[PDB]
Each structure stands twice: as structure tokens, then as C-alpha cells.
């Protein structure tokens, strides 16, 4: 039972910053790929960003230059720093642990930005 812990969201005024975290535990076969996805009520899963074991970072055009992903090799965890927040980012975000077979999916943290 590979388990993913996501934390660090909530309500933040426009222009604020937050840092969400996913800890992947269990099997998580070494050549894994951890990604972040967006879903606002009424829309689909929007690919926010992706990082592989190669250390390469891939970001979408929606949040150009605003969101960053950081890796922790010792615990094999991931933290996205979401800064310069805009009301268009009001959506629940989820983790995509590609692993090497049984793709895992997240539990969710609410991200709200409005004034």
C-alpha cells in the first residue's frame, strides 16, 4: 500500500505564498515520476507540473514562472512552492506518483486565493 501525504494548503489572500508537500511511502520503485495536477469545481484534471528522477522539471503555460518544485532525495519527497497567487489558481491539487506500474493518486488539499 503505497501512500502519499499531501499537506500545506488553505486560504490565502491574493499575492501570498504557500508550500505544499507530498511524501511518497511504501514501494515507490526508484525510477519514479512525481507530478501535480489541478482541479477546480466544474473542470478536469489540469497538468500543473511534473518532475522525474532525472531532476528535470516540466511546467505548464498556465502558471509560467510562478510555481516551483523541490525534491528531497533522502526522503524522496516533493514540495511545490506556489507563489504570486491569483484567484484563477483556486483549485484542489493532487499528486501523480508514476512509480513503475501501479500509478498512485492523491487525497487532496484545498487551495483558495481571493479578495
Amino acid at each position: 500500500q503505497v501512500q502519499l501525504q499531501e499537506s500545506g494548503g488553505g486560504l490565502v489572500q491574493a499575492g501570498g505564498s504557500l508550500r505544499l508537500s507530498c511524501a511518497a511511502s511504501g514501494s515507490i520503485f526508484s525510477p519514479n515520476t512525481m507530478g501535480w495536477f489541478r482541479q477546480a469545481l466544474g473542470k478536469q484534471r489540469e497538468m500543473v507540473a511534473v518532475i522525474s528522477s532525472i531532476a528535470s522539471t516540466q511546467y505548464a503555460n498556465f502558471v509560467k514562472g510562478r510555481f516551483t518544485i523541490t525534491r528531497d532525495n533522502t526522503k524522496n519527497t516533493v514540495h511545490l512552492q506556489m507563489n504570486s497567487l491569483i484567484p484563477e489558481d483556486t483549485a484542489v491539487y493532487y499528486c501523480y506518483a508514476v512509480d513503475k506500474s501501479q500509478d498512485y493518486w492523491g487525497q487532496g488539499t484545498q487551495v483558495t486565493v481571493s479578495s
Binding site: 500500500q1 499537506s7 488553505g10 478536469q44 492523491g106 487525497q107 488539499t109
Partner: protein, 99 residues
């Protein structure tokens, strides 16, 4: 809600204690340990499940529950909700809402 024979979202949908339960329930307030100023949402709680739990039965399923007649297929929407909501643990909360 943590005692044999009781009901509630934790008693039915969470921790299931049996009638014959030779043992002790022990608890203390964690206001200065568990709460943060911005709210600690690391503790997640289901409000919806298909059925009540068996005693000492533990479910870590994250499947989106179908509140309507249409299937959710792992995607929220109309009458589709994720199982776990987060808790507003804050140091200014009242005793009822304190950790």
C-alpha cells in the same frame, strides 16, 4: 464517540469499537501541540461511506463516493465528493473544536 456501542461519523464511519471491549480510552487536550495559527489541515476525516465499519476495521481507500445515480469514475463533480475533508485546528478555537 470513542466508546463501545456509540454512533457518530467517527463511531460508524471511522474507528469501530466492539461491545465486549476490555480496555481503556485515554485522551488529553492537544491545543498547544497540534494547532497552528494558520490552521492544521494534516488530519483528514471522511463524512461519506457506502456502509458502516466492522470492529477495528481500517479503510484507507481514497475512492470518490457516488452521492447521485451517475458514476464518478474517480472524478469529482455533481454528486461526487472526495472522502476526506480537513480540520481547522487553530489555537483560538473553542474547546469543542480544539484538538
Amino acid at each position: 464517540q470513542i466508546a463501545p456501542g456509540q454512533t457518530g461519523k467517527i463511531a460508524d464511519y471511522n474507528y469501530k469499537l466492539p461491545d465486549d471491549f476490555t480496555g481503556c480510552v485515554i485522551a488529553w487536550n492537544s491545543n498547544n501541540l497540534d494547532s497552528k495559527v494558520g490552521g492544521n489541515y494534516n488530519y483528514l476525516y471522511r463524512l461519506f461511506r457506502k456502509s458502516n465499519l466492522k470492529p477495528f476495521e481500517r479503510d484507507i481507500s481514497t475512492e470518490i463516493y457516488q452521492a447521485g445515480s451517475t458514476p464518478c469514475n474517480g472524478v469529482e463533480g455533481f454528486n461526487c465528493y472526495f472522502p476526506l475533508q480537513s480540520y481547522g485546528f487553530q489555537p483560538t478555537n473553542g474547546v469543542g473544536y480544539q484538538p
